Amino acid sequence: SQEVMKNLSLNFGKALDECKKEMTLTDAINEDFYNFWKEGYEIKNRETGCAIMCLSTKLNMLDPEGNLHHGNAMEFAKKHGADETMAQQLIDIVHGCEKSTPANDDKCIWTLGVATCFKAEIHKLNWA
């Protein structure tokens, strides 16, 4: 289902401008979020990584552990209209990159990769 998925990404990217002012993030992340659904775009602004992570915080997707509130991530999905196997898929992929995807200590870099693997799955699922 793409219909709801647009709403998820939409309502995810609400608090972005707050995070921009907070963390000094450039306008160049609008571009990533606008062109994210291209057929061979590659995401190399580390700031989009950190913007995503700030949005994830603001949408309350972090447990006390910092290992993703997969619990609340599923609420977000069903809250926006998501199917069951859908909401499970987004967690299984996300949970399935939060550690599998290597990065440095750089949590911006980290979350950038977690989004970038996950993106490709959304393409395979034809959710774009």
**101 secondary structure, DSSP code:** S
- Contact (CB, 8 A) for 28 and 45: yes
- Contact (CB, 8 A) for 94 and 70: yes
Fold type of domain 1-128: Recoverin; domain 1 (1.10.238)
Distance separating alpha carbons of residues 5 and 77, to the nearest angstrom: 9
Q: What is the CA radius of gyration of the chain?
A: 14
Structure tokens belonging to residue 2:
């793409």
- Contact (CB, 8 A) for 86 and 1: yes
Distance separating alpha carbons of residues 73 and 34, to the nearest angstrom: 23
The amino acid at residue 32 is D
Q: Where are the domains of the chain?
A: 1-128
Distance separating alpha carbons of residues 3 and 53, to the nearest angstrom: 24
